[PDB]
Design a protein around this ligand. Structure first.
Ligand SMILES: NC(=O)c1ccc[n+]([C@@H]2O[C@H](COP(=O)([O-])OP(=O)(O)OC[C@H]3O[C@@H](n4cnc5c(N)ncnc54)[C@H](O)[C@@H]3O)[C@@H](O)[C@H]2O)c1
Ligand SMILES: Nc1ncnc2[nH]cnc12
Ligand SMILES: Nc1ncnc2[nH]cnc12
Ligand SMILES: Nc1ncnc2[nH]cnc12
Ligand code: NA
Ligand code: NA
Ligand code: NA
Ligand code: NA
Lengths: 493, 491, 493, 493
């Protein structure tokens, strides 16, 4: 076949893990039971760019049982679970391009391949997906950047110069990711300069999983640059309040335990950013005896951290004394090379944000005279030549829970993924409203509170939760339906 | 001097506590420093209906320093701190009608008096602005207008104001009966009193969840008669006061009212919203085993993620030791539930109103025996089983009834929002055009102001904030000076 | 001296009612009354108690009374008495009480002396107690210092000089407590210089409640000066691990909430000493959002605090920045006037150790030009004249949980007091072994582990605890009896 | 190569982890610095039977730097870190017989080989160790059982019958461990029936690491059968209060995260036993959102669990509703086959006690028609054919933190191992006092409180702890030396 994965012989382990995971993924199990016969997604071509773990394999299985054809890749070079990928290829329910420890070059080739579909009516013609499941916005990015590249290509009838240069606007070296994405774009311009624009015609939407990808979408829609409908899954209550916070509470610890040999108790651990992710990280770290110090730019989030008993400082105030540093900002250049040069001997550094940009990994790796050794797989020790002091970086600054461990557990991933499937169903069912002879610019929407509550209802039995039912008069008293929704749209939970 | 308070000699203690509280109430301290010279509220008549604690006295002082004239009453019969009330009167900062342990009849007379301003000698006016907590000042206004319109239509006092029963034959609550008593009395003195106030009314700023629910209902029915600002839903209010305020003040209330150890006890928290979340955190912090009840499946899952068992009251009523209602709903704990509780089980409410517990049904149960264990703590014994339950402050909000409410730091956060809301309503008063039949609505303060409230309190706690570079600000799509989060962010 | 001296007898009904409610949780005392009220194992015993007279203490007294003892009682702190608890006892006529909240230091010592004075029926001379229940060692102290004073008096047939001076060997002013104790001793030397030695004849033992009192007993024992058998109740496992730690977790908070108007969340609160009391204090404080900073002289205790996520610093390094200071050491001069002068405006200071000596209250009150105002009952604000800065002291440095609130709750006090009753029964039953005619050395002992486990068993039903029972095979495997004891003598729990 | 390990090529990774671990193992770093020149253990032959992890390699390095010759094996078939073992062999500091995933037969062969020394004056002659580092008592067991076997062999001039039968005196199958130990003893009786008694001549002591091993020592001591001096390291305060509790708080979570795919949050997790290990387990589990239910036979421990907010139940009342079961009792038959048959679908079972005896793994494996599948490394799903329900067992009931993860982190292991080195030095230095012609009775002792406090002091800087120093006046007031010890011998911390 055409899938590219590490080892098909790992499939049986993957299949058995999926069955065990399904004990807690009650949302996905119910969607399969309810919709596998009617197949609401029949005829949809779905491309997914989302960390391919066992939990993700259950998502793909659900989409498949609902009638979709599927092509998939991971949204990080280190996050794929190879047995999970093998399971999908063995069952033949998706075409997969993913493996743990991809090179950045291979990453962009896998994504591009996941986006490429064969035309059943013409062996020569290529087409794209009808729907995209995205985590971090890379599938959405390559599509929009591809369209922009094709437009610039026609303007001067040549390969745009920005795709051939290794420098950016300010003369600074382009990130490897940008250079590797541009390499793919140049190759596609030479094969067919109408590829990306051609795909737009049959694209009915994208459902985005994480905060960083949603930020990208928000920038696009506020500028009239979003070229397909989008559903923001990150901001469903049953996603952000659970996955982002409670998922990290467990998965950050798992990543640190695997990557960092030291005891966490008693250590000064800096959590940079106290949003939904940072809140969960702090709770987990404190739970095992660490003394958490928070950094924040938001005065409200800073006060919330103080209410939980955490010191709030600017990084420079504590960088020479703290033991471990965890970035959870979704921002860039939060931990610079100059910060690293002042850290104590064998300080640990990790990132849990979507992109590696939070830490200046390139600057560290290219610091003049820096010495590097691999401590264990995906853990590296860097020694500065002047001081002879070392810092230890977990999985090259990539998201540590998925890079050094296996990401969030099945229960919260089922909550996030039940939202994903409902989003895909919504986009597919509404596809006739996508009329590009009338509107070519689109907006981001969220799932209804009714569906959000439904996602929660589907997982109550996993934990033996017994829900109270309102009486008719109580319902009238608080002005709600007995069946919900129970809260106003602006409720913060 | 027409103020009605318990004891003016308590003023000294009140004034001293206000000065200590100000070390932490930096938002109010800054508003006073910044605006006492320009006086943005100069000439504004403000009526407040909000628990008169030491923290509230600092709020009143702030409104006074900004130029307003003030009349104040508490929004609960047990929540006033008498030394706080005395301080305000002694210093001539406001006219006060409030004391701890008011009868229900006096409560409504106090509120009515706080709403009454002078002009002629015998001609009266209403407030320009209202600071409300629970919606009682807003309620008496709207019900008063409604009573006046029906009185003028038939030239007789509306029948509903005279009867003791509701639509189904059940006795009206004592609070509703006493409010109606005042409304009838005012209809007979001046049948245009309430409608007369509307002309000079520029807005109400509402503090708590129950009051906001009341406002939304009025708004949806097109019956809101003045602009409103929802202060409860500022991030610096709901995420701090409702949750972290209760984490401390619920424990203070229980420690004062309940003699027993909380550690090891099964304590049921009914409702796991913003208040219930804080209650559970405090209870767990002192060793209790918290069990949650919920109607909202999302909230129930949240409780489970914090390690709490989520059950229906019926399955734990005979086994649990203490019950705390935090729903803002009614009839959550009934007489029948109470009869199944274990010997000396404790019952308390932290929601705005006493409605969560059927206190009337308990007090009026045939052959029930009651004894006062201590101030505002009563033991009820059923005649058939001879078993007893102990109720804290007749089901009234326990943190204010058995203790002194939230501490100065979070109250300053809530109250800085109140002052900003009052200033906003006053500044835009020229846009309230009564000749045009316009709909009034409920709005929230801007995120810019919300973040400002937080900024003013960072130094209290030695918080050091990081500043975004221009590059970083552009990367996350925000201004270096905020706001830092989208409008739908849940914190 | 057969007439009680209390604040107000009309508070008796409230006291009686609180006692019945408290009994719901004090199942240890309820069971001892049920089991022994008929046989009266303490019949004929004269018991003098010097222990904070709260509602919980009224149930202890009721227990001793139901077991057949005659009782005289006083509190071991000038602020710890609950006046309604004292009234209940006098109304019921089950003890002669000398206690009220807010005693002068002079009246404290007069009350203790009155509690130690029993009527002699054989013409109108005085007797002492047969048994003593002590908390802090003041009853034990006045007895031993009384004997010393009489011996010194006999050497020269005059009142010893040390009883009359205002100074100590070093030349510094004696504490008010020492001066007032000495005035009582001089009075009794003038009345009858054989009083104290006469009491020894019928004195069979003392059961000591707290850490400070036990330290005093151990010093007397090692010097060969202990004049009666003693039982160390503080060190029962069911006392130290519960009362000292979990009692304070609740009662420190109650004290602080009553005395300190400020929010604890986010504040830097220094807990000086991280022993059994300090551990519980830190737990409670963190539980309501405080950031606890610990001071310690013991490296083991310091590491334990670090394992719970607390910063461990020396006071000098945090005195200018912290918000609230809580002494829990059992030592002296832990917070000096010089420390207080460096504290931030409106910093709060409180003590939870047995004696006020941890804080230099005398130096603060007598600081030249100091200004003081009563903020509320038992809360004082002191302002220094040179800086105009103020500090707020809770209940003049006396134990804050009892001074500003009502001490520990009934459940843990029942565990502590069940040990007290068992100790009293032990001392009484072995009274024939005390042979004053021989040059006998007296020692301190602890209750057996069997009785310690028994105390715990008696309270399991309070909390609905379901205990597992060992099978014969399991009991043999771990080498214990099915009925206990379950742990070796050196087990630390 | 005399050593028997998995792969020598893993040495470089092991050596680098040792250097990183030393950042926190300041106790071992200091002992190396202080004693490497004088070599107090010069000439000592030390055999160790203790889980060979990276932390253990630093212990071995320390003993080696202090002059000892060393032979080592692990005390569990799954606990060895192969890279740690390779590091020791590569630098030639010990002869090692250990690898992860040993068969039980190989386990006993490795221990026997670790106990075998070729004396310096003749290659053909065999001798034993001078000192033993033991964790669980297996090295001590084979010695005593060896001696007993030799005595029974002489009594009838033949192989004792108990060594050849596969059944016990009750007709029940002997454990595989006992059968494999007996196989080695029989083999050694045929080669030299004086091997074990001959070793006694040069044996000066054993230092025991864990609770189960100490229990075994105390039983031997009480029956007068202990054949060498013993030091109980488990009961040093800096061992039991840190390793047993805080080590497990982190390492149980690590083992569960590796072995159990499910989210711990919201799950009913039963912790059987609330002693030192159980306390740490509960703290970590609740730190990541689990609802912990405790079982206990000790009423004091049961009340302690209740004070921390945990329900205390009997296994029978929660076996059908709970999600995960963790045994921490040190007892046997705590979880039987009958209990397992009642568990919900995909319930997880793990043990963290020293031996697998806590769970009836043999009964499970021998259940008629049971189906077993390997889910992942050291994780197996068992399906009962009559109900078709499955349970998932982590590492066949062997200690899960070491079986599914890497055991405790460096900081607490340094505290435990600093105690081990001091114990070995104490035993070695007092060797002349062992006179086997006269004193036939040996005892168990503990290290002094002075040394216990010293271990803590050595690790304060790791965590930036600043210790307060008593003034002369304060030291006199609390009756201690400024330099300690600071607590009485019965203090429970
Ligand atoms: N005592 C105080 O100082 C204080 C402070 C703030 C708010 N309040 C009051 O507390 C109450 C709750 O406020 P909130 O902000 O937490 O509101 P909220 O809406 O955030 O929380 C209420 C929760 O109760 C649940 N609920 C409703 N009916 C229920 C029932 N019958 N059984 C179980 N659960 C039920 C809802 O699902 C919701 O999650 C309001 O009356 C509010 O005005 C009091
Ligand atoms: N296990 C997982 N699979 C996919 N996406 C994730 N994000 C976090 N954990 C994840
Ligand atoms: N102390 C207080 N004052 C006013 N309103 C409150 N709501 C809760 N606590 C309060
Ligand atoms: N990592 C480890 N090495 C040796 N023994 C241990 N006991 C617990 N964890 C251990
Ligand atoms: Na995962
Ligand atoms: Na208050
Ligand atoms: Na008490
Ligand atoms: Na380890």
């Amino acid at each position: 076949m055409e899938s590219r994965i590490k080892d098909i012989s790992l499939a049986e382990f993957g299949l058995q893990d999926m069955e065990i995971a399904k004990t807690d993924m009650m949302g996905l199990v119910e969607l399969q039971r309810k919709y596998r016969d009617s197949k609401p997604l029949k005829g949809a071509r779905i491309t997914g760019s989302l960390h391919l773990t066992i939990e993700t394999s259950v998502l793909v299985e659900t989409l498949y049982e609902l009638g979709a054809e599927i092509r998939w890749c991971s949204c990080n070079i280190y996050s794929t679970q190879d047995h999970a990928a093998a399971a999908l290829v063995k069952k033949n329910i998706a075409t997969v391009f993913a493996w743990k420890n991809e090179t950045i070059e291979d990453y962009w080739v896998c994504l591009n391949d996941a986006m490429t579909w064969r035309n059943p009516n013409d062996k020569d013609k290529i087409c794209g997906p009808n729907l995209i499941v995205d985590d971090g916005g890379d599938a959405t990015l390559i599509l929009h950047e591809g369209v922009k590249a094709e437009i610039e290509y026609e303007k001067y009838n040549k390969i745009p110069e920005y795709l051939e240069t290794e420098l950016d606007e300010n003369g600074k070296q382009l990130s490897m990711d940008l250079k590797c994405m541009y390499k793919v774009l140049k190759m596609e311009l030479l094969k067919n300069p109408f590829r990306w624009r051609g795909m737009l015609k049959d694209l009915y939407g994208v459902s985005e999983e994480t905060t960083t990808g949603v930020l990208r979408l928000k920038i696009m829609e506020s500028e009239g640059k979003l070229l397909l409908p989008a559903i923001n899954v990150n901001d469903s209550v049953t996603k952000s309040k659970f996955d982002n916070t409670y998922g990290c509470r467990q998965s950050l610890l798992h990543g640190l335990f695997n990557g960092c040999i030291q005891m966490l108790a008693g250590k000064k651990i800096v959590v940079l950013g106290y949003g939904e992710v940072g809140k969960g990280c702090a709770q987990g770290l404190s739970g095992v005896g660490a003394r958490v110090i928070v950094t924040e730019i938001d005065p409200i989030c800073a006060l919330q951290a103080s209410m939980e008993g955490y010191q709030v400082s600017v990084l420079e105030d504590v960088v020479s004394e703290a033991d471990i540093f965890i970035t959870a900002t979704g921002n860039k250049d939060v931990i610079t090379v100059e910060h690293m040069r002042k850290m104590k001997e064998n300080a640990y550094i990790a990132n849990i944000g979507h992109f590696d940009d939070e830490i200046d990994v390139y600057g560290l790796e290219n610091y003049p005279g820096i010495k590097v050794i691999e401590v264990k797989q995906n853990v590296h020790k860097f020694t500065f030549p002047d001081t002879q002091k070392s810092v230890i970086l977990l999985c090259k600054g990539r998201l540590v829970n998925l890079g050094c461990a296996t990401g969030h557990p099945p229960l919260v991933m089922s909550m996030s993924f039940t939202n994903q499937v409902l989003a895909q169903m919504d986009l597919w069912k509404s596809r006739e409203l996508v009329d590009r002879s009338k509107n070519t610019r689109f907006f981001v929407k969220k799932l209804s509170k009714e569906l959000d509550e439904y996602v929660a209802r589907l997982h109550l039995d996993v934990l033996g939760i017994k829900l109270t039912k309102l009486t008719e008069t109580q319902a009238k008293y608080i002005n709600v339906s007995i069946n919900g929704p129970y809260k106003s749209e602006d409720y913060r939970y």
